[model samples]
Target: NDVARGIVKADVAQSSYGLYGQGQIVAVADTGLDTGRNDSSMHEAFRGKITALYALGRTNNANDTNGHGTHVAGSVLGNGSTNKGMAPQANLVFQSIMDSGGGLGGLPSNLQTLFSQAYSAGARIHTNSWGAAVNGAYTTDSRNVDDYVRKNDMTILFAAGNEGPNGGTISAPGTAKNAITVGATENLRPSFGSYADNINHVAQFSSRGPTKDGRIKPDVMAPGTFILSARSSLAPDSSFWANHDSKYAYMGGTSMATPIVAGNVAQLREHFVKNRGITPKPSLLKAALIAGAADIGLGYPNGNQGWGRVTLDKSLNVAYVNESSSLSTSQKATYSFTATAGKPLKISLVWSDAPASTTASVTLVNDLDLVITAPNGTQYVGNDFTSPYNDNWDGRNNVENVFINAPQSGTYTIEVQAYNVPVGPQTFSLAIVN
Candidate 1:
């Protein structure tokens, strides 16, 4: 089956079944999480999972004072009774970078220090749901700090922010090259005291982008507006507003979207390590996420929803290599092959048309007519057209041509020929990978 199918809402429950991000760790760089409140029940998922929580600005305390961080953290790894997070099995490492006043003028150094600490503590993914307004340049010290994080192979996810309609550029930190800038989508339903209007629509208040260098920002979209997440502990029932429900509350902005993507990344990391036996690099993971995204806007990607929406299942199923090829024709065709040692090679040819004399054939040879083994380590021979009508190379075309083991680091030749009657030049594309 084509594994790159885009993820749809209908598959969430089934897709996540048996796929738990139990051992992955995600770091949230936001206001701070309230670990001591009943209203913050969304953190139940981290009950036995939190490894370290740090407050970047102050000398002591890693608790939420401004409430934003708590909400962002909950969206990523929370496990509230009513509100489900994207990666419930993942652990969280929270950081309080912004103070109670919502001021981050002291953010540059604090941002650097926080990321360095998170890295040292072994956090693989860092989510930043905050940013300043763009000032024509991403010269802020936070940008440099993010560079350091990327240099260490960490994936950074940032909120594009709530400042749109003007198409204002994204702010620093979010503007960092290696960070995945997230945009907000409105909630599907309207609720009391909810900022749900733009649930699926890109909020006018959310930032728009075409980075300074013209690259798209807000790489992907997620459920951000009116998102239900953990609230602050200071208020009655720890609600954003006193009359709201105690355990869950609704809020909006790219702040919510950023964490959703972060959670998805955590899940993907788990899927990769557990299923593929591969620990993907940040770029590979990022590319997989983009290539597997569900195209939400026009067919072409836009500044908003850069490659589309994040779909963990689809992204996790994709396999990428250097090349691939296919062939089709009414008559017959020939192929050539070569390879090097310790490097695997795959070759496939298919014919769709059927006719009385329509036949396909292959021939194999080496530099000195030496015997070559196929993928299955079988001997190859010339004039091996056993099933000229339909047959797979099986990495073995003709006895002499196939090399079960990768060839030593040297040159080899493969010659192929097909016979039949066709009108014009047969069409086929060849793809090569190392």
Candidate 2:
């Protein structure tokens, strides 16, 4: 936990703010949970944290015969006993979507049935580490994810599939416009990969994307390689992990990376509700996360890594967070701020757009633009990174970002202009850091 914690700096939040996901309820939907298949015999790490267990669709049993769900649960909220979870104090609501034959065919026709169950059980954040194999296609499953977040106040996270270094290979549901898509990065574990593939680089197996419709995907990256977490005693799949002891095991993939971010999201939400006395919307959290993300070794806002790796240390206290902003087809909103000459400025805008039809070529239903003006009258837009840290205009994404390394010590203007919104006014979240 400390090794992955170092890369994302979640330990810093724990140390500085005492936010351990206390009083937070996070839902995890995966293969199954391995608490001895009954409440009487619970795993040591997940004894008191398992709030509820259920099997969805055709699955009759809630036992984790595949071992994938058990490891994922351990990553999200397993209290340490030689192995540590990211949010050890958070309560869990586990939904088993696996079938009797070890296949995921047990899922319902609509995902909202499972999502609504978790919401009714008092979950505000849902983590899904599995998806369909369709490469970058905005399928009906993807639309359902966007539909749920639009109506609910919950934050949903999906794993970018393990399909790879290849572009446009992200899986369905992960291609959803509103859900946070997570990719894999390396841990410092020397036993995981070659020396050249370290924490500074994106995992070679982590999927890359500019979704089939030309939108950025894998909204963030996290540690997924050689991750040591709780292991299921009943695991029949020996080839799943690289190493295992009695209580702890190791695995790697975007599956490993997604839960780490979900756990951190719980911690961040806990902080907002406790200290700030307000529950931030999913879009606001997404904006804050994107605003503070460190551009990985590759670059900023590319298809491979998106905004960059998740860093809660920078995201915890943003300079500005606006949650109730809205705009129409041609309307625009302006924000003015003053910056120092040498200080860096970063801004991000995220909106939960209307879900597109599965047959549509472009999945982006509403397009918004982020335009920034410097003191000297020069302009920089989103998604087009120029030298010295300015960017060009972007037209094909619902998420936009602009970074400036050194400003001219004067007032600057930022405009969020609606390029097209055939679905009427769109509410959004904007985060700024200078």
Candidate 3:
């Protein structure tokens, strides 16, 4: 088990950064946990902090017939006799959907119901360690759940899967458009499995993306193979397993990676709540997690590692304040700027506090063919701002590629609309230049 290495690499000793996820709620929707172990590491890690635990598979209750959920639970918030989970203090809520056999098939409706329940229970971060196989067109039912989660300002993290080469595609829940997909990586060889190949040069088992909707999935990667954490005695006892006291064990998968990311998020949320005094929205949390990740695996937004490996410390250290002022329902907020003939104009939207939602639309009509740039210099065509172009700004606090353009020295009007805002005052900074 690489628990010691992960703890050191993740830098959990520095309490000066403040607890990033102290009071936040994290929901794990997977196999059920084995709550029977008196010395369960999960219990020790989050004994008094678990707010809710529900089993959603066999019976509409919370139970861990299958050990996956229990294992995942321990990874996220376990405190075994010797090992420690990533976010030991955050509240843990479990929603079991996988059956005893680690079944892949699950009713979309049942999954949706579980998600709804978790949201109602006030969970901001939801972690899933499973996904369905990808065939032709990307699925959409779970995508709706992804939309709702983001719409409600909650972050959902899904494992990109363990089927690497043979299955060139990521499964359903992972492919969901708005969900923050997670990929796996090896801390050391011979842990879990190799990274996927050909599919964006990722781990052999890692899911490939460029979703049917054309958006990148698996927002990031984490050390999953041979990960050490709390384990359930209910799990199959294997001599190959390196057990720590009876409550701890080492395992790997995108499943393990998902929770590590979630734990980091918990820490980040805790830091924000303790320092900034607010729970980060899904987008803000996503941004911090992605932006702060260590860019070691591959290029930016690569398939294997997405935004590279997650960097908890960097994510915690960076301060992102989302600032936005409310505009009456239909009111338009316009920020004006000029761009040179060759250079493009870039605009950034940084929120002071997490916002419920933010939308930006630009109209740049110049005498010559004008090119508008997004936050990353992506060009936009004429009047092509619709659903396909709509960007989700959840207001945690980050920069966005609202508009980019090189106009022919003419007056350009950019209209920004932010709605469904979280109840409170907010601030937004709009910058325009060539």
Which candidate number maximizes TM-score? 2
Q: TM-score of the candidate numbered 2?
A: 0.95
TM-score versus the correct structure, for each prediction: 0.66, 0.95, 0.69
Model 3: lDDT of residue 419: 46
Instruction: Give the per-residue lDDT of model 1 (tens digit) for 225-318.
Output: 6566766664334335323465556666788778878877877788777877877656556655655555565433256655566666656665
Error of model 1, residue 423, in angstroms: 50
What TM-score does model 3 achieve against the real structure? 0.69
Candidate 2's C-alpha runs over 4 A off are: 36-40, 57-60, 195-197, 237-239, 387-392
Compose the digit string of candidate 2's lDDT tens values, residues 15-45. 8888778899889998877753546577777
Evaluated with lDDT, which candidate comes out highest?
2
lDDT of 1 at 107: 50
Predicted candidate 3 versus true structure: per-residue lDDT over 1-434, tens digit per residue: 23423532455523556463567789888766666322334346556667776655656545555456777777676655555667766778777676545563333464566677887888888888877776212455454554475346677788887766443366667765456778776555444344311222344566765444343456777767666676655676552134545666666577777888777777777776777676666656676665555545354334456556676666664444333343433344554444455744433333323211112111110111112434343444322334344343322112333333344555444444444333323334343434
Which ten contiguous residues of candidate 3 have the minimum total lDDT?
Answer: 360-369
